[PDB]
Amino acid sequence: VTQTMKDLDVQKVAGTWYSLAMAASDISLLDAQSAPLRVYVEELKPTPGGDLEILLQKWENGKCAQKKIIAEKTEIPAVFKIDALNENKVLVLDTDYKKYLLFCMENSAEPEQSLACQCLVRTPEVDDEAMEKFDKALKALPMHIRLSFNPTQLEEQC
Amino acid sequence: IIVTQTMKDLDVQKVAGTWYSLAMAASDISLLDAQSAPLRVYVEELKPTPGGDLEILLQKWENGKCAQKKIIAEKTEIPAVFKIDALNENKVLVLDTDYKKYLLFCMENSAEPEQSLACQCLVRTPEVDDEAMEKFDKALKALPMHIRLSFNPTQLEEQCRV
C-alpha cells in the first residue's frame, strides 16, 4: 500500500529539480514525447502562504515550452489542488528535501485513468536510492508504463 | 553491463502454440515509445520446427492496421539463443519459461546490445499472470531498461492495438 507522506515542509522542496523517472497507469498518457502527462519538472517555487508553483516543460507545438501550474495547499498535509493537465491533484509521496521527491498527479474523479507519478531529483544524475523508493511506491500502484532518463537526457531535459 | 541468464536445456517444441505479449521493456525509450516504434511488437504464436528453429508470428501496428510478421529464428549452439535477421535485430534469447503459462525473452542486436535490447514477458492466456510479471521484473532488475509497458486483458485480446 503506497501513500501520501505525513508532514510536508513545502518551503524545503524549493529550487531546481529534474524528472529522473515517470510512470502512468495509462500508457497513452505517457507514451510519446507529446503525450499529455509527459511533463518534466524544472523547478518548484513556494508561495508565502505555503502553496507550490510548479515549473515544467512539455512538448506543446513541436517545441519545448515552459508551463506553470499552481498547486493550492489543503487541510491534508501533502495533497494539493491543481487545475491543469486534466489532473485535479498532486500527492507528494515521499521526500528528504535534499536529494529526491516522489509525487503523483491525478484526477480524483478517475484516479486510475489519470494517475501519473514522477521521481524528481536535485541534480542531473541517476540516484539509485531515489529509484528504489520510486520502484517501491510503484509496486503498489496500478502502473502500465515507466520511463527513466540518462544524465545526458536530464541536463537537456525535454 | 548486461548479463542475462539463459534457459538451461530449453525444449523448444514445448513453447508451441498461442501466446500474448503481457509486458515489454527496452533499454531505449524510442524503441517502444509509440505504437509506431520499431520494437513495439505483440506476439501471436510460436511455431517450432523439427530442426529446432522457431518461427515467431507477431503483429505490428503500421497504417490503420495490425500487420502480421513472420520471424524465423534459427538455432545456434545454445538452445535458448536464436539468430534472427528482423526488426534490425539479430538475436533472440529465451531467459526462462515453464512452457504451460509464461515465457520471457529478449531480442537484441549483438553489434549494439545495450541500445538494441528489448525484452518481453509472454503468457498463454490473455490474463495478467502475477507470478509471470514478478519473474519478468527480476529478469529486468539488472537490465538497462528505460521503458516498460504492460497490457490489461482487453488489450491482450485485441492483438497489437492499445
Short mmCIF file of C-alpha atoms in Angstrom, two decimals:
data_model
loop_
_atom_site.label_atom_id
_atom_site.label_comp_id
_atom_site.label_asym_id
_atom_site.label_seq_id
_atom_site.Cartn_x
_atom_site.Cartn_y
_atom_site.Cartn_z
CA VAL A 1 0.00 0.00 0.00
CA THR A 2 1.62 3.26 -1.26
CA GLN A 3 0.73 6.55 0.45
CA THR A 4 0.99 10.29 0.76
CA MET A 5 3.57 11.39 3.31
CA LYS A 6 2.78 12.63 6.85
CA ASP A 7 4.24 16.15 7.23
CA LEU A 8 5.49 18.06 4.19
CA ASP A 9 7.57 21.22 4.62
CA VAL A 10 6.73 22.84 1.31
CA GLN A 11 9.47 25.51 1.72
CA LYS A 12 12.35 22.99 1.67
CA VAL A 13 11.14 21.39 -1.60
CA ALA A 14 12.05 24.75 -3.20
CA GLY A 15 14.50 25.06 -6.11
CA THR A 16 15.84 23.07 -9.09
CA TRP A 17 14.60 19.57 -9.81
CA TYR A 18 14.92 17.07 -12.66
CA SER A 19 12.43 14.36 -13.64
CA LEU A 20 14.54 11.17 -13.48
CA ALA A 21 11.63 8.76 -13.94
CA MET A 22 7.89 8.68 -14.64
CA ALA A 23 5.18 6.13 -14.56
CA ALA A 24 1.49 6.32 -15.51
CA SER A 25 -1.48 3.94 -15.13
CA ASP A 26 -2.42 4.59 -18.77
CA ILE A 27 0.23 4.06 -21.46
CA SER A 28 -1.07 6.80 -23.75
CA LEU A 29 -0.82 9.50 -21.11
CA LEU A 30 2.95 9.00 -21.06
CA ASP A 31 3.54 7.39 -24.48
CA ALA A 32 5.05 9.85 -26.97
CA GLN A 33 7.21 12.90 -26.41
CA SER A 34 3.91 14.79 -26.83
CA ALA A 35 1.83 12.58 -24.53
CA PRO A 36 -0.35 14.69 -22.17
CA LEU A 37 1.45 13.78 -18.92
CA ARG A 38 4.96 13.68 -20.34
CA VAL A 39 5.95 16.78 -18.42
CA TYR A 40 9.44 17.43 -16.90
CA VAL A 41 9.66 19.35 -13.64
CA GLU A 42 12.33 22.09 -13.87
CA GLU A 43 11.66 23.93 -10.62
CA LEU A 44 9.40 24.16 -7.54
CA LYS A 45 8.56 27.65 -6.20
CA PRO A 46 6.59 28.03 -2.94
CA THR A 47 4.27 30.96 -2.33
CA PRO A 48 4.50 32.62 1.11
CA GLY A 49 1.16 31.08 2.15
CA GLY A 50 2.58 27.57 1.51
CA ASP A 51 1.17 26.83 -1.99
CA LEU A 52 3.62 25.30 -4.55
CA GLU A 53 4.32 26.73 -8.02
CA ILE A 54 5.46 24.00 -10.43
CA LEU A 55 7.76 24.97 -13.34
CA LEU A 56 7.92 22.35 -16.03
CA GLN A 57 8.46 21.61 -19.70
CA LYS A 58 6.16 19.93 -22.15
CA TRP A 59 6.15 19.45 -25.92
CA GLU A 60 3.43 21.90 -26.98
CA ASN A 61 3.75 22.52 -30.76
CA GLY A 62 6.83 20.61 -31.85
CA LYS A 63 8.93 22.66 -29.42
CA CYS A 64 9.83 22.51 -25.74
CA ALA A 65 7.85 25.03 -23.75
CA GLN A 66 7.52 26.11 -20.14
CA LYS A 67 4.20 25.54 -18.36
CA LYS A 68 3.26 26.98 -14.96
CA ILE A 69 0.99 25.11 -12.52
CA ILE A 70 -0.15 26.33 -9.12
CA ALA A 71 -0.68 23.63 -6.51
CA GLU A 72 -3.00 25.03 -3.81
CA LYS A 73 -2.41 23.65 -0.31
CA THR A 74 -5.24 21.80 1.51
CA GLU A 75 -6.13 20.62 5.05
CA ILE A 76 -4.48 17.29 4.18
CA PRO A 77 -0.70 17.84 4.52
CA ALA A 78 0.87 16.64 1.30
CA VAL A 79 -2.13 16.95 -1.05
CA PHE A 80 -2.57 19.96 -3.37
CA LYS A 81 -5.41 21.02 -5.67
CA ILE A 82 -4.36 21.87 -9.23
CA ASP A 83 -6.43 22.61 -12.38
CA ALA A 84 -4.12 21.62 -15.20
CA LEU A 85 -3.05 18.65 -17.35
CA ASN A 86 -6.64 17.39 -16.80
CA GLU A 87 -5.46 16.45 -13.25
CA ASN A 88 -7.02 17.98 -10.12
CA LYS A 89 -4.49 16.77 -7.51
CA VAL A 90 -0.79 16.43 -6.67
CA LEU A 91 0.26 13.98 -3.91
CA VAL A 92 3.81 14.15 -2.57
CA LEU A 93 4.54 10.52 -1.64
CA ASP A 94 8.00 10.97 -0.09
CA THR A 95 10.88 13.43 0.12
CA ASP A 96 14.08 14.11 2.05
CA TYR A 97 14.21 17.67 0.59
CA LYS A 98 17.89 17.43 -0.36
CA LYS A 99 18.10 14.60 -2.89
CA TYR A 100 14.67 13.36 -4.03
CA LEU A 101 10.90 13.99 -4.19
CA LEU A 102 8.31 11.41 -5.31
CA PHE A 103 4.92 12.78 -6.28
CA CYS A 104 1.83 11.70 -8.15
CA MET A 105 -0.74 13.55 -10.13
CA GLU A 106 -4.29 12.52 -10.77
CA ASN A 107 -7.85 13.43 -11.39
CA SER A 108 -9.86 12.42 -8.30
CA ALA A 109 -12.90 11.56 -10.43
CA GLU A 110 -10.95 8.94 -12.46
CA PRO A 111 -7.95 8.05 -10.23
CA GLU A 112 -6.81 5.09 -12.40
CA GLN A 113 -7.23 6.68 -15.84
CA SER A 114 -5.26 9.62 -14.57
CA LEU A 115 -2.51 8.51 -12.24
CA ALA A 116 0.99 9.56 -13.21
CA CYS A 117 3.92 9.64 -10.77
CA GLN A 118 7.41 11.06 -11.14
CA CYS A 119 10.76 10.74 -9.33
CA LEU A 120 12.30 14.18 -9.17
CA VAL A 121 15.99 14.64 -8.31
CA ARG A 122 18.02 17.70 -7.40
CA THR A 123 20.96 17.11 -9.74
CA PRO A 124 21.03 15.69 -13.31
CA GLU A 125 22.23 12.19 -12.36
CA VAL A 126 20.76 8.73 -11.79
CA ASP A 127 20.43 8.40 -7.98
CA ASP A 128 19.82 4.69 -7.35
CA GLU A 129 18.43 5.29 -3.84
CA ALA A 130 15.69 7.56 -5.25
CA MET A 131 14.89 4.96 -7.93
CA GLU A 132 14.38 2.20 -5.31
CA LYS A 133 11.92 4.26 -3.28
CA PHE A 134 10.28 5.07 -6.64
CA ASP A 135 10.15 1.37 -7.60
CA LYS A 136 8.69 0.52 -4.15
CA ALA A 137 5.90 3.09 -4.41
CA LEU A 138 5.24 1.87 -7.97
CA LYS A 139 4.89 -1.77 -6.87
CA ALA A 140 1.67 -0.91 -5.04
CA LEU A 141 0.33 1.36 -7.80
CA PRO A 142 -1.52 0.17 -10.88
CA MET A 143 1.16 1.32 -13.37
CA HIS A 144 1.32 0.18 -17.05
CA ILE A 145 4.26 2.33 -18.25
CA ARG A 146 7.54 3.56 -16.73
CA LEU A 147 10.35 5.76 -18.09
CA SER A 148 13.78 6.62 -16.76
CA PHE A 149 16.22 9.11 -18.23
CA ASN A 150 20.01 9.41 -18.66
CA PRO A 151 22.21 12.11 -17.15
CA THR A 152 22.52 13.24 -20.83
CA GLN A 153 18.74 13.42 -21.12
CA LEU A 154 18.41 15.22 -17.77
CA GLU A 155 20.76 18.15 -18.49
CA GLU A 156 18.94 18.50 -21.82
CA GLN A 157 15.52 17.82 -20.32
CA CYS A 158 12.72 17.71 -22.93
CA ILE B 1 26.87 -4.24 -18.06
CA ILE B 2 24.23 -6.55 -19.50
CA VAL B 3 24.31 -10.03 -18.02
CA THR B 4 21.38 -12.28 -18.75
CA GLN B 5 20.63 -15.85 -17.58
CA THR B 6 19.50 -18.17 -20.41
CA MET B 7 17.03 -21.04 -20.04
CA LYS B 8 19.01 -24.19 -19.26
CA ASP B 9 18.31 -27.08 -21.64
CA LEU B 10 15.29 -25.33 -23.25
CA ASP B 11 12.94 -27.66 -25.10
CA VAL B 12 11.60 -25.55 -27.95
CA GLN B 13 8.86 -27.97 -29.08
CA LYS B 14 7.11 -27.26 -25.78
CA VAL B 15 6.76 -23.50 -26.50
CA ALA B 16 4.45 -24.23 -29.45
CA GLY B 17 1.10 -22.52 -29.69
CA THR B 18 -0.59 -19.26 -28.87
CA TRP B 19 0.92 -16.53 -26.70
CA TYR B 20 0.27 -12.88 -25.88
CA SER B 21 2.78 -10.16 -25.01
CA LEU B 22 1.80 -9.19 -21.48
CA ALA B 23 4.74 -6.83 -20.91
CA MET B 24 7.68 -5.32 -22.74
CA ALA B 25 10.69 -3.28 -21.85
CA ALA B 26 13.50 -1.74 -23.84
CA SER B 27 16.77 -0.05 -22.99
CA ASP B 28 15.90 2.78 -25.35
CA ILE B 29 12.70 4.75 -24.96
CA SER B 30 12.42 5.41 -28.72
CA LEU B 31 12.35 1.62 -29.28
CA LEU B 32 8.99 1.29 -27.50
CA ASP B 33 7.84 4.90 -27.30
CA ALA B 34 4.74 4.79 -29.55
CA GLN B 35 2.61 2.22 -31.39
CA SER B 36 4.80 3.03 -34.38
CA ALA B 37 8.11 2.42 -32.58
CA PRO B 38 10.43 -0.16 -34.20
CA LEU B 39 10.31 -2.88 -31.43
CA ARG B 40 6.64 -2.44 -30.47
CA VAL B 41 5.65 -5.96 -31.41
CA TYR B 42 2.91 -8.19 -29.94
CA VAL B 43 3.49 -11.92 -30.21
CA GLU B 44 0.71 -14.09 -31.57
CA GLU B 45 2.31 -17.52 -31.78
CA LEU B 46 5.45 -19.62 -31.56
CA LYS B 47 5.78 -22.39 -34.19
CA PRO B 48 8.83 -24.61 -33.58
CA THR B 49 10.33 -26.61 -36.45
CA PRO B 50 11.68 -30.17 -36.08
CA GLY B 51 15.26 -28.99 -36.76
CA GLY B 52 14.95 -26.78 -33.66
CA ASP B 53 14.25 -23.42 -35.30
CA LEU B 54 11.39 -21.26 -34.08
CA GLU B 55 9.03 -19.32 -36.26
CA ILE B 56 7.53 -16.40 -34.40
CA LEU B 57 4.28 -14.82 -35.65
CA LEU B 58 3.75 -11.35 -34.30
CA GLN B 59 1.84 -8.16 -35.01
CA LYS B 60 2.85 -4.58 -35.60
CA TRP B 61 0.60 -1.51 -35.89
CA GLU B 62 1.61 0.08 -39.23
CA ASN B 63 -1.12 2.05 -41.01
CA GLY B 64 -4.62 1.71 -39.57
CA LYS B 65 -3.85 -1.94 -39.10
CA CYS B 66 -2.24 -4.66 -37.11
CA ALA B 67 0.12 -6.18 -39.66
CA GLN B 68 1.32 -9.77 -39.32
CA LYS B 69 5.07 -10.54 -39.49
CA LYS B 70 6.78 -13.93 -39.67
CA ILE B 71 10.21 -14.12 -37.97
CA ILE B 72 12.19 -17.34 -38.49
CA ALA B 73 14.65 -17.72 -35.54
CA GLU B 74 17.36 -20.30 -36.23
CA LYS B 75 19.10 -22.48 -33.70
CA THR B 76 22.65 -21.90 -32.59
CA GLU B 77 24.95 -23.98 -30.39
CA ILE B 78 22.98 -22.68 -27.35
CA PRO B 79 19.32 -23.95 -27.12
CA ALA B 80 17.92 -20.69 -25.67
CA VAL B 81 19.81 -18.38 -28.08
CA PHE B 82 18.46 -17.95 -31.63
CA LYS B 83 19.72 -15.92 -34.57
CA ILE B 84 17.30 -13.70 -36.46
CA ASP B 85 17.53 -11.03 -39.11
CA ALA B 86 14.39 -8.94 -38.47
CA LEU B 87 13.39 -5.70 -36.72
CA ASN B 88 17.04 -4.67 -37.22
CA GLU B 89 17.84 -7.24 -34.50
CA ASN B 90 19.98 -10.38 -34.81
CA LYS B 91 19.44 -12.39 -31.62
CA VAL B 92 16.51 -13.90 -29.68
CA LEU B 93 17.29 -15.10 -26.13
CA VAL B 94 14.77 -17.11 -24.13
CA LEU B 95 15.57 -16.27 -20.48
CA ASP B 96 13.08 -18.55 -18.74
CA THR B 97 9.83 -20.38 -19.26
CA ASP B 98 7.58 -23.01 -17.68
CA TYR B 99 6.02 -23.83 -21.10
CA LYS B 100 2.43 -24.00 -19.74
CA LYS B 101 1.93 -20.34 -18.62
CA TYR B 102 4.84 -17.85 -19.15
CA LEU B 103 7.84 -17.24 -21.45
CA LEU B 104 10.44 -14.50 -21.02
CA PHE B 105 12.51 -13.48 -24.00
CA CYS B 106 14.75 -10.78 -25.27
CA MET B 107 15.84 -9.61 -28.64
CA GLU B 108 18.93 -7.65 -29.47
CA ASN B 109 21.48 -6.62 -31.99
CA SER B 110 24.85 -8.06 -30.89
CA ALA B 111 26.57 -5.09 -32.52
CA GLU B 112 24.86 -2.70 -30.07
CA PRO B 113 23.46 -5.00 -27.36
CA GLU B 114 22.73 -2.17 -24.90
CA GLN B 115 20.92 0.20 -27.27
CA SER B 116 19.01 -2.57 -29.07
CA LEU B 117 17.72 -4.67 -26.21
CA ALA B 118 14.03 -5.34 -25.82
CA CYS B 119 12.50 -7.97 -23.65
CA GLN B 120 9.04 -9.29 -23.22
CA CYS B 121 7.00 -11.36 -20.85
CA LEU B 122 4.74 -13.76 -22.80
CA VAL B 123 1.66 -15.58 -21.39
CA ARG B 124 -0.53 -18.35 -22.72
CA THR B 125 -3.93 -16.89 -21.92
CA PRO B 126 -4.99 -13.23 -22.24
CA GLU B 127 -4.81 -12.63 -18.44
CA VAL B 128 -2.40 -10.92 -16.02
CA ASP B 129 -0.31 -13.80 -14.71
CA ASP B 130 1.01 -12.30 -11.47
CA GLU B 131 3.83 -14.83 -10.98
CA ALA B 132 4.85 -14.12 -14.62
CA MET B 133 5.30 -10.35 -14.12
CA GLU B 134 7.38 -10.91 -10.94
CA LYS B 135 9.81 -13.09 -12.91
CA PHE B 136 9.91 -10.50 -15.70
CA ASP B 137 10.69 -7.80 -13.11
CA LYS B 138 13.54 -9.82 -11.56
CA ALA B 139 14.93 -10.57 -15.03
CA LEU B 140 14.77 -6.80 -15.67
CA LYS B 141 16.23 -5.71 -12.33
CA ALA B 142 19.73 -5.95 -13.86
CA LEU B 143 18.95 -4.94 -17.45
CA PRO B 144 19.45 -1.31 -18.54
CA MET B 145 15.72 -0.70 -19.32
CA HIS B 146 14.33 2.84 -19.63
CA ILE B 147 10.86 1.88 -20.87
CA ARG B 148 8.49 -0.70 -19.50
CA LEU B 149 4.92 -1.33 -20.73
CA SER B 150 2.24 -3.82 -19.60
CA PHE B 151 -1.22 -4.58 -21.00
CA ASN B 152 -4.56 -5.26 -19.47
CA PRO B 153 -6.57 -8.43 -20.55
CA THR B 154 -8.67 -6.49 -23.02
CA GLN B 155 -5.56 -5.13 -24.78
CA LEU B 156 -4.18 -8.71 -24.76
CA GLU B 157 -7.28 -9.94 -26.61
CA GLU B 158 -7.15 -7.08 -29.13
CA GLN B 159 -3.86 -8.10 -30.75
CA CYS B 160 -1.46 -5.14 -31.11
CA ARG B 161 -3.87 -2.21 -30.77
CA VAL B 162 -3.89 -0.49 -27.38
#
